[PDB]
């Protein structure tokens, strides 16, 4: 029932500056407590977060723990800045545990200045993601992974910053007509293979598609610039801020800067050779991009 938060955060921050790949061995109960305690905070806040600027918005991390540390040094460690992550914290290179544990720890320590949305990598199956499940059983046991899905099943799904910036991991949904449909989604829940919650975590934009198209991922859909424009006008929004796709400069605009894609994992896999970005929003809702170039 009790967990030394600063002891955990210290050992997690102690690997800063090391050559990425270096681990942090927390006790099994420490990780489980991080999951359980943060889960209570997720359930005690809305599933559609309503946040106010200033805050720094980040895209996928994909377990690249050493790039997350670099993000916090550039942007400022919590609580020096407010953070909203858009999902995909886990993935493979046997450092997903440190990535998710540090984010969950900061979520517990600063629950109203640090925020995490759900990405498609925070699913409750190994239908499409295996690395994080693989890492949990290799370092601990499969039950530890089950406890993580309990935490994941209670993550919020989307966020609206100052009634003007809509944020989610994937993108728009053809079933999304009102914000009420997002707020009515009840937790815990898994990610379905169809429907609003699935598309909010999986869909992509496409220059080619005229409206709604099929997704080359095999799940959800693709929407075009017109979809974006109708969505922002119907809900009196200015911008959709999304992640989910690797982009060259860590950021990429779409539909005349009405959508932006964020990606905070430099050199994903090491074959694309992309940069990481981070979008900073200030009190007057003005957006600036800080870029994390691949260390190697």
């Amino acid at each position: 029932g009790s967990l030394n938060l600063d002891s955990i955060i210290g050992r997690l921050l102690e690997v800063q500056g090391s050559r990425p790949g270096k681990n942090v061995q927390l006790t099994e109960n420490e990780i489980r407590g991080l999951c359980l305690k943060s889960r209570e905070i997720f359930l005690s806040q809305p599933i559609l977060l309503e946040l106010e600027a200033p805050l720094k918005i980040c895209g996928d991390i994909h377990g690249q723990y050493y790039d997350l540390l670099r993000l916090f040094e550039y942007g400022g460690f919590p609580p020096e800045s407010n953070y909203l992550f858009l999902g995909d914290y886990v993935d493979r290179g046997k450092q997903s545990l440190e990535t998710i544990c540090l984010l969950l720890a900061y979520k517990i320590k600063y629950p109203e200045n640090f925020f995490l949305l759900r990405g498609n990598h925070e699913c409750a199956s190994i239908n499409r993601i295996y690395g994080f499940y693989d890492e949990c059983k290799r370092r601990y046991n499969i039950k530890l992974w089950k406890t993580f899905t309990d935490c994941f099943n209670c993550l919020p799904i989307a966020a609206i910053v100052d009634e003007k910036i809509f944020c989610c991991h994937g993108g728009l949904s053809p079933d999304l007509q009102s914000m009420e449909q997002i707020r009515r989604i009840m937790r815990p829940t898994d990610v379905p293979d169809q429907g609003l919650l699935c598309d909010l975590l999986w869909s992509d934009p496409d220059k080619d598609v005229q409206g709604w198209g099929e997704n080359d991922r095999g799940v959800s859909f693709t929407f075009g610039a017109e979809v974006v424009a109708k969505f922002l006008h119907k809900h009196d929004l200015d911008l959709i801020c999304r992640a989910h796709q690797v982009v060259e400069d860590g950021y990429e605009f779409f539909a005349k800067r009405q959508l932006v894609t964020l990606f905070s994992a430099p050199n994903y896999c090491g074959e694309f050779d992309n940069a990481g970005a981070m979008m900073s929003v200030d009190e007057t809702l003005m957006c600036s991009f800080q870029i994390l170039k691949p260390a190697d």
Binding site: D162, K164, H244, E252, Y268, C287
Partner: peptide, 24 residues
């Protein structure tokens, strides 16, 4: 008044700059 999303002068519109984009 309201509150509008603006962009700083340094930020580049890389939409039509042929930036690479992949699905994980």
């Amino acid at each position: 008044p309201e509150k509008k999303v603006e962009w700083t002068s340094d930020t580049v519109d890389n939409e039509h700059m042929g930036r690479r984009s992949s699905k994980c």
